[PDB]
Structure formats: C-alpha cells, structure tokens
Amino acid sequence: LCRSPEGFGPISFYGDFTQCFIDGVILNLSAIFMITFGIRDLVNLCKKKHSGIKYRRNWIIVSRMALVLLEIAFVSLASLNISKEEAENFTIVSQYASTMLSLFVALALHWIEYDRSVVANTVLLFYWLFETFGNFAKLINILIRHTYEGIWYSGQTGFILTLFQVITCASILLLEALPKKPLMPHQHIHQTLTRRKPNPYDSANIFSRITFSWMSGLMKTGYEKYLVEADLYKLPRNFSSEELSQKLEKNWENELKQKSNPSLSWAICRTFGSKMLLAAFFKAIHDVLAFTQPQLLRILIKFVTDYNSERQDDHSKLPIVRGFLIAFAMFLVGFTQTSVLHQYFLNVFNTGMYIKSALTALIYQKSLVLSNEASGLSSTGDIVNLMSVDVQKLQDLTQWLNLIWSGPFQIIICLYSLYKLLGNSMWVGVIILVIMMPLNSFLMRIQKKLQKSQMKYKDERTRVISEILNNIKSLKLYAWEKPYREKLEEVRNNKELKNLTKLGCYMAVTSFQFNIVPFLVSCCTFAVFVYTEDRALTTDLVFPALTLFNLLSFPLMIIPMVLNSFIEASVSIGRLFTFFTNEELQPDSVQRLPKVKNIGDVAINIGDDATFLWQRKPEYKVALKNINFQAKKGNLTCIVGKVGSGKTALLSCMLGDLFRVKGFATVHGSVAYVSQVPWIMNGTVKENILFGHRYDAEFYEKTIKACALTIDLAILMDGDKTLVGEKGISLSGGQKARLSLARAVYARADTYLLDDPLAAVDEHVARHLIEHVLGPNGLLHTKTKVLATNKVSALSIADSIALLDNGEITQQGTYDEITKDADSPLWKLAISLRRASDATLGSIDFGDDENIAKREHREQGKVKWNIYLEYAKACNPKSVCVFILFIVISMFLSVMGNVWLKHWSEVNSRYGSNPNAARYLAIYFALGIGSALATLIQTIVLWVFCTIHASKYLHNLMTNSVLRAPMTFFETTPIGRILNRFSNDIYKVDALLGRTFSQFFVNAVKVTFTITVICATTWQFIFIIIPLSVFYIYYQQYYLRTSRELRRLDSITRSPIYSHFQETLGGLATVRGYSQQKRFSHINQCRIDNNMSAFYPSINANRWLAYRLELIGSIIILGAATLSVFRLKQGTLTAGMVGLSLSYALQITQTLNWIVRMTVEVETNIVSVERIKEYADLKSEAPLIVEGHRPPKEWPSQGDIKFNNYSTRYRPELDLVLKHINIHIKPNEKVGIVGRTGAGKSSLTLALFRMIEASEGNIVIDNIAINEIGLYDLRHKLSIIPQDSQVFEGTVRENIDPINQYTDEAIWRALELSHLKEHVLSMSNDGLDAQLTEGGGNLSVGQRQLLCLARAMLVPSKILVLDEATAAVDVETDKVVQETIRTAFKDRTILTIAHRLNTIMDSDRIIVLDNGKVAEFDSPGQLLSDNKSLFYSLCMEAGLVNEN
Ligand SMILES: N[C@@H](CCC(=O)N[C@@H](CSSC[C@H](NC(=O)CC[C@H](N)C(=O)O)C(=O)NCC(=O)O)C(=O)NCC(=O)O)C(=O)O
C-alpha cells in the first residue's frame, strides 16, 4: 500500500503521473528487466570461446567506467536524506533497494561487453533509455507541485540530486550509442581484398536498425557520381540461393515420401512462415494506435470549453498545464505509430525475396532429369513462362496477405467507435455501404474487359509495321509508300483511338463514384440525428466524427483488389504442382566402370537377349530385342541399317535414356558424343572449342590443323573473336558439323560415339578426315570408337561390322566374309595423350556501363526543361489551363463546406436546441455536391481532349519522317532497335504518362490549402514552416538522383536469367552426354545472385525516405497544438477554431510522402518523348516532285542512254567507285553487262535510279538531264526485275496492283503468260480474293520468281533492267524468261547484268568493267575471234572456249 493522499491512479489532477506510479511501477520494471536478462547474457558471453580479434583500450571504456561509478554515489547520498515520515511508505523505500543491485550488474557487464562483442549490447541500450525517462518525469512532477501549491514536497537536497541524476544517465546513453571501438595496430592484412566490401547491415546497433541510418553512406555516393556495378556491397548472411533451396528440398521430399496426399503449399508455409507470424503483431499494434487520436481531440475541445466558461462566469481553478500535456501526448502517439509500421514492411518484403530464389533454383535443377517424352509434351517457349510469370505472382501476393484479416478489423473498430458518440443514429452508415460496395465491384469488371480488348490492336499495328520495315528495299523501288501508309493509318485511327475514349469515360465515372461516398454517409447521419434525438448537436460531436468517417476511405478501396490476386495465384500453384511430379529417368539402366588397360580388352557388353522400351506409358513399346553386341579397344566398329531401324536406338541405349526390362549393360571410361544435328552455344569460337577445359596451345593447333577449319578462318577474315549462335552471324552447312567434331576431338575421351557426321561435307573432305582423324593414321589410334554410318569408305576401312534391323541383330563379321559369303546389301550396294584438365570455378563478371556513362557524364538532371514544353505544345495549351483551373475550384468548395459546418455548430450551442434544421442542411448538401461535379469535369477534359491529341500528333509526325530517310539509315541501324520505338515508347505515351501528372498536381494543391487554413488562425506558424521547407528540399534532392540509377541497374540484370534457361533447354542431350551438369547449375546460381544484390538496396531506399518525411508531420501537429494553447491564455480562442485547425493537420502525414514518390514516376516516363523527337527530326531526301519540269506522259519514247563523264561514290568519306564513264547505248539494243567479282557492278543501277547522288558529271536520257526531274516522276517510269523476291500479306490483287489502275483482263493475261493460274485456283475458289500468308509460305521460290516476272509483265515501258536476277533465277525458269524476252519485251531496250557468261552469249554488245574503269566495249564475235583479248580470256575462265 501507499501512505499518500494521491493513490495508484495513473493520472493526477494536473495531468501528469502521480509519484506513487513513477516509483512503484516504471522504476521497478526497468530494474527487474536488467536483473533477469543481464545475468543470462553475461553467462552466454562467458561460455563463448576466446577469439583472435582484440580491441585496444582507450578513453572510451575509461570514461564509461568513470561515469557509472557516480550513479552509485548519488543513490547512496539520496538514500540517507529520507525523512521520518517517508520511511513508513513501502513504495519509496523499495525503490533504492531495487535499483542498487542492477547498478552492480550493469557495471560488471560493461567490462566483458567491451572485449567479447562487435556491436553494442541491446539490453544496455534499452535500460538507460527507460531510466532517463523515469527520472525526467519525476523532475517535472516536483516542479509543478511546487508552483501551484507553494511547498517543496522534498527539500532542495532531493531536487538538486534529481537534477544531477538525470544528466549522468543522459551522458552514459550517448557514450554508449555513438563512438566506435578502435582495432589494434596489427594483424589487419585481411583488409586487402579486390572484391566488393562487406555489407554495413551486419554491424549496426539496434537504434540504427530502427531508424535505417546504415543506408546514409550510399546516398552521398550516388548524389555525386553515376553508380556502376563496382559500387554495390555484398549480400548479407543467409541470402545465398544454394543455402535457401536446400531447406525447401528437405521439407518437400519428406512431404512426398512420408504420407499419401502431398501438397506444395504446406511445404512452403512450414519453412518460411515464422517471420510472417511476427509481422502480424506490429500490424495489430499500428491498427490500435491509429484510432486513439480522435479521443485526444475530443478531450482537448472539451477542456477549451470548460476553461472559457468558468473564467467568463467569474467575469460575470483548472490549471493551464493540463493543456500543454495533451499536446505532447499527440506527438508521442505519432512517433510510436511511425516506428512500428516500417518494421512490419521489412519483414513482409524479405519473404518475397526468399520465395523467388528458392523456386527458381528448384525449377532449373528439375529440368535436367525429365525423360524424353515428358520433355516432348510442351513447348520450349512455354516452360520459360514458369519463371517469367508464375513465381512473379507468388512474390507479389505476400505484400497483401495480412489485409484479409486487417481489413475488417479497422472497420469494426470504426463502427463501434461511432456507436458511442451518436447512439442508434449510426445504423444509416451501414446500409449505404451495403448498397454501394457491390456496385463498385461490378464496375471494376467492365474495365478489365475493355483493357483486355485493347491489347489486341497493339499486336495488329506491330505486325503491319514490322512487315513494312523488312521489305523496304522493294518499297523504295516501286514507289508503293502511298497505299501502305494509308493502310496503316486506317487501322491506327479507326479502332485503337476509338477504344481509348471508351476506357477514358469508364475511368471518369468510377472516380466520381468513389469520391462521393464518405460525404454522403455524414450528410445522412447528421440528418437522421437532428430529427429524432432530443439533444443539441454541438462542436465536440461534429468535429471528432469527421475524422472517423474519413478513416473509412482506405479499407473500402483495397478490399476488392486483394481478392483478385488471391484468386489469380491459385492457378499458378496447380501448374507448379503439375510440373514437379513428372516422370524421371531410370537410374539403374546402365552401369559405369573404370578404364580398360590393354588393346585386347572388350569395352562394352550387351547380351542375354536384352530388351529396351521406347515408352513406359500408356502401353510399353518394344524398341530393341535379342541384342548381343561387343566392341574392342582401338578398332573402328561400324553399324549399317535402314532409316528408322534400331540404328539410333543403340546410341540412345548406350547414353542410357531407354528403360531396361531384361539383360545387362556396361560401359567403361568416359564418353564423348556428337549430336546428328549440331548445337552451337552463344560465345566465341575459342570457347566453343575449349568447352570448359584448360588451354594447351600445341594440342589446340594440332586439333585445328587436323580439320579444314583453318581455311574457313582465313576466308572469313575474322579470327576466333567472331560471335556465333542465334545472335551471332549465321554459319552454314558443313561448318557446324566440322566445329562440333573439332569440339569433340579436343576432349581426348576414352570412348567416342559418332552419330554419322560425315553426311554434311564434301567427299574429299571426308577423305581428309579419314586420313587425319579416323583409322590407324590419326590421333585416335588407341581410343575405341563406334561410328554409325552408311559410307562405303568407312565400312571398307571398318575392322568389324554388324547388321541391325527390325530391332534385332541378324549378321556380323569382318568384310572379307561379307564379300565372300553374305550375299547381302552390305556387298550388294599402348599410350595416348592424357585427359585434359578442367578449368576452375569462380564468379561471373559484370559488364561496364562506361560505354553510356561517357555520354551521360556531361550532366546530371539530364532531362531538360525543353521536353516538358514540347509535350505541352503537343497538347493544345489552352486545354492544360482549363484542366488546371477545375482542381482549384474543387478544393475551394470543399473547404467552404467545413467553414459552414463550423457556423452551424456555433449557432446550435447557444440555444441548446436545433432551430431551422431544414434550412441549414440544404446549403451543406449543395456545397458537398458541387465539389464532386468539378472532379468529374476535369477527368473528362484530361482524357478526351489533352491526351488523345498528343497520341494523334506524335505518331503521324514520326512515321512521315522515317519513311523518307535515305538508305544509309536503314543499312547502319539494326531493325530490332527501330521496331522498339514503334512498339514500347508509343505505348507509354498512350497509356501511362498522363496519369502521373494528375496524381502529382492533385496532391500538391492539397497541402497548400491545408497550410493556408492553419496559418489563418495563428499567424506565428510562419516561423515554423520556413525552416522545415529547407529540409524537405534537401531530402527530395538526395532521393531523386540515387533511386533512378538503382532502378536502371536493377532492370538491365533481369533478362540474362531467362536467356540461359532457353539456351540450355535445347541442348540436354549434349550436356548429359558430357556430364556438365554441375558447371551448368553453378552458372545459373551466379546469375540469380547478381540480380538480388542490386534489388536489395532499391527497396531499402524507400524506407530511408519515408521515416524522415513522416517525422516532419509530427512536428507540424505539435506546433499547431501548442500555439493554440499559448493563444488561449490571452482570452481570445474559442472551441470552433481549434476544432477546424486540428481536424486538417491530422490528415497530412501520408501526402507529404506520396508527392516525392510521384516525382520519380514522372521523371522515369518523360524520356520516351525525347526518344520519339529524336527520330522525328531525322534527315531528309531529295524532293519527290519538281512542278515546273514535269515530263509528258510518254517521255521515254526512245531507249537511248548517254553518259557525260559521270563519277560517283557510295559515301563522301570513301573513294570514287565509278570514274570518267562515257558510254552510249543505241535504242532497242540488247546489252550484256559483265565484269569480275567486286569490280563495282552493283553501283550502276543505283546510279541509274538516283539512289546515289552524282559526284561528277551527269546521266542523260532522251534529251533531258535526269537531275532536274522530281524523284517520283523519274522512278515511276523505269521497269526493273529485282534480284530479291518479296511477298506481302493480303490478296494476290494487292500483290500485283494495290492501286487498282488496271482491268482484270490484263491481270489474268499476265498470269496466263506466267503459268500461275493453275496453282492459285487449287488453293482457293476465291480467285483474286485468295489471300497469301506471311512471307509467302504458300509460294515456292520459283513461284515467287514467276510472281515478280508477272509484276514486271504488267508495267508498260520502253526500258527494262534485269538487275542481277540471274543470281537467284535458275535456268529452268530462265528458259521461260528468255522466251518472254523474245516475245513480250522484244521492243524494249534491255540492260542485262550477268551472273555467268553463258546466259548472255546472244548480246549485241558487251561492256567490260574493271575497277571502276571501262576495259573495252566491243562486239562479242570480234572478241571471241581475238584469242588474246580480255573477254576471250574471261570465256576461257568460264571454260566456254575449251568447250567449243
Ligand atoms: N495508412 C496505410 C499505410 C501506408 C500504406 O499502406 N501505403 C501503401 C501505398 S498505397 S497509395 C494509394 C492512395 N494513397 C494516397 O493518395 C496517399 C494518401 C492520401 N493522400 C492521404 O490523404 O492520406 C490511396 O489509396 N488513396 C485513397 C484515398 O485517397 O483515401 C503501401 O502499402 N505502400 C507500401 C509501399 O509501396 O512501399 C495503412 O493503413 O496501411
């Protein structure tokens, strides 16, 4: 018991703690805490082993030990000052006896703490915090009792002792927290490391873990230079994927073998779940502290009313210190509420990083054991979506998982809180929510329907654009850009840009409907209160209630969204459980034994009439039967058989794929294998030869010289640095087979299985390989080798051979017996190089961003203010002003609604009843509805008038410029980068950029009106908000620069995880043939860890920002509450002013954070306008039309061509390729153009079509210089048979005449002349309206050539050019072309460019070209009669001279 006039009640009359509560509870629990935990920690640290790390003794530990020995002196002196009256009180005398033991424990613990730990001990940090707080409360408690009652409750001794006793504890706390221990001067050589430096999270004390201050070192670095992958720290302890997947495998395997009904989700839950049970505790404590602030607001308003009232009655007892203490509790609640929420976010964000790394690494190691058929059940492009999609949805689910119980909890607390203020009137708030929640969930479906519809038209536009960009060479010649531009423009304008406006309207209606509900609940609740209850509606019922209505906004929004992800994640679990249960290879299928010793040894045995099964299910199929087979060292063993017999099955047996039911098999030593179809990995040719082995130069050069590869390296003129694969340059033919054999031979294995490689190559090359590799001559003299082939030479040199058919062996022998006795279609047609060593493992190197940072280094804040003005002029600039005005109107009316509510409450309080309620209520309804209509109008203006006009303008501007670029742009730029801008960058401008400007401006005006409402009541708030603006700018500038570089460095690393999986899916027979599984798993795990070490600091920068921007809001609440109580003393404050001011300040803490988060979404998306405007201003070409010079309709009436000293070059920086050409062609003449390879023949037609400009001279046709003519009027008239045959989708009529200039009769006549009519009619009865698939898959190459000939047939002209078409048109078609030249084109002048001299022997005259100079121009007969002439020498090179 306490012998005191004030009891154990926590709150005194003056508003602070009673003395009995301070002494008996707060300063006792913090003593028992240290007694119980310090002994345990002291034991565990004393049992710990000695370690070599030692810290030097220094002033730190001397100071700590000096300070802690004064506390015992002050408690000692204070314990004698006790008077005779106080010693009969149990709670005060218990205090010193409880404290004095814990001081001795702490003094002991500092000593062992200094030597045996790296980080400041946690219990020491919390004990001194509690003991500073408990003593400061006692100092305040003595002061206010002195001031009001006039006596010292304890003499000046106890006061001055308490004053010293606070300062000593406060000094100990900071000497514990801030300084760091110096290491000894020696044994510090472990700092020398070239790798990344260790992560700073592992050495932070608990106060730095709570405030995230360990992250401040990276922000100063990223602010002053571009980050690159050499700056990132290592991952922490226990984040490695090899560690993580070995936990989950044990639980899943136990799940399958222990019990009858497995499931995957339970195995996931029981291993990672234990942290998400801890996250629920912090979520519940936050949800309880959130709903406390309206109770302190109710208490403060009622205190203002009582203090004004009794003073005014005294004009016609409560202390002022009670007002200053409530304003301090409103700061403490906000500080604790901030401190627990981000410890919830840390624990939920780490579990997604664990789940992703466990599942990805189990999927990869699963794929290496799937049998042939289960691997055949699905697409290679589809198993990769298990990584790209399915684990991504399981990652994103965890951030929402606790809201399934946290959502209803807040809404039940809110309804029960409103029940106590207002009574039975509350129930109208339930019915409106019951009506309007299903309507909103109904509206959320039709948007998803429209959004799924929108995604098709993207693909249709992308396909049309890609098909234009591939065939640009034909478009340039035929002047066909006019139909295809309109064909694209029709699809762009008349579907997609219609569908956008519909989606815009459906978004606007949903924004209105979601805005109006929390107003409508309050208006109906006040309206039902006024007409039924017999009570005055006063200020402290009205202004606390608004905050409780407004807290219902967030849980109503988020409840429908979490259900969608919960349904969506349920399919993915079933897909992964399907995948993990497939059938697996039989382990026992073949034995593996060590090497043989001597050349007589048998290497392999199969016998006892073994049988092997092609499949296990649904019915097993007999692959092999009665097999009895052997092989010996050294000798070449070959096997022959029909295609589709057991030939392939023996090789598949010896690799161990098939299922065994009878017999036995064994293989000695290592196996090297070559697949029949080659597999080429992405990399250098050097690495494809080495394939993970060490480098020995002599054996390497021997291996290359044993193959034809050396000349192939010489011909390409590029060494082993040439990239090869899918994205390298395309090798062809026997080169791949030669490369595969070169890979295999370098391994020096003890058994070779060769699956018929010789079919790909020349026969003399095969002879060369039989000289240098196979037989007794080559390097493989002592290795066993089995080659399955049908080659007569190989079976001639074979030492033993056997015949396999129908799955059974029928004959075998040496070939002498076969020649003599078999009468069969086989006739009736001691030392070696030691194994190469394996290279060692390590880490996968990163790339260097220097290649782009050298351009970026000229500035930071690299997006200029110009691009914002370019986008705001693509939008009509009046519409932006009309968009801005209505945000201000909407916020102004909402503020005036609450000023009217304040006036209504002040009128009700004076009367004690509710007069004129129907008059007062209608104006509040009007001001509340006029604020929703203004929110509707701005969204209609934004979607229909601002955005669609920009999306209309930009694409039309870009396409016109791209379609008129000269050929150099298309030759130098890879098409995979041109198509990206048409596909992704237009999409971000269409759908995502417009929304973030809305969410920026709507939140930015709200805090300006909030600060105006606060400053209008107490004008001294000016001096508070001005120094807080400088910190707000300081933090925003540090976050902006660093976060975008961390996001980019994340993004570039994510793709190479999946390319490796797609590359390895194609090669499982090779990888399993060389036993490279361990290396191929290790590469994948390094690829995962490189991504996670860049994803880890990205999410922690958000927590670092948010703690510091939410701490400003609590100082704003403290300052606004305190200045009103300073104003109350002057006698001027009233209850309505403090209610209106404090109801706004409590709602500001999230907006300050969301503005700075939206600034980076604006800056990320605005780059797309810069990249579009890059291509818009691209360089021009010569004019299409020159109006003053336009030739008559029939201008080429004579086919006469004249050269006037013409010269030209491909590019200005290169040499002249044609020089001083003077040539004259007679009308109707048939000219042969021929010359040596690379002499510059192809430039002639580009000069003729003016695709290249003149450097000197000119070309003249029929008394006009062609340089004066517009390019369309020039290129329209010529006729060309191009060497490239190119097909477009759509009708045959579109492929012949897309302009509809000509009748069907001419079309059918041309098709009749081209022999095409019979084939198309068999395809479809539609005739001309029959449609051709992409790339002309229905047409053979000869059909494409005949189609091009029909295209040339339809165009009337006096001139034709056969521009090198003989490079693809074979003689079986060229005979028809010759007949067509004799019959139809006979009247024309014809220029023919020859692939071979045989095709042009009927030429009237020939021009010989050599190195840009005219060699001779003479008749063929005079050349062929001059045996020493140049053309005669060319015919001798062609062999026609010797032929005749
Ligand atoms: N109070 C929140 C805590 C914060 C929170 O959960 N934030 C979200 C962001 S939702 S962002 C969605 C949006 N928020 C805002 O517009 C900001 C709040 C507002 N301006 C205010 O005045 O409080 C909204 O839903 N507005 C509805 C409304 O206007 O009432 C989150 O999970 N962030 C984790 C992360 O991303 O790291 C809660 O109860 O959980």
Swiss-Prot record:
Predominant location: membrane
Q: Which domain of life is it from?
A: Eukaryota
Which SUPFAM superfamilies does the record match to this protein? Answer: ABC transporter transmembrane region, P-loop containing nucleoside triphosphate hydrolases
User: Which molecular function GO terms apply here?
Assistant: ABC-type cadmium transporter activity; ABC-type glutathione S-conjugate transporter activity; ATP binding; ATP hydrolysis activity; ATPase-coupled transmembrane transporter activity; bilirubin transmembrane transporter activity; P-type cadmium transporter activity
Q: Which positions does UniProt annotate for ATP 2 binding?
A: G1235, R1236, T1237, G1238, A1239, G1240, K1241, S1242
Residue numbers carrying Phosphothreonine: T840
Misc note: Present with 396 molecules/cell in log phase SD medium.
**Would you tell me the protein name for this molecule?**
Metal resistance protein YCF1
Please report the organism this UniProt entry assigns to the protein: Saccharomyces cerevisiae (strain ATCC 204508 / S288c)
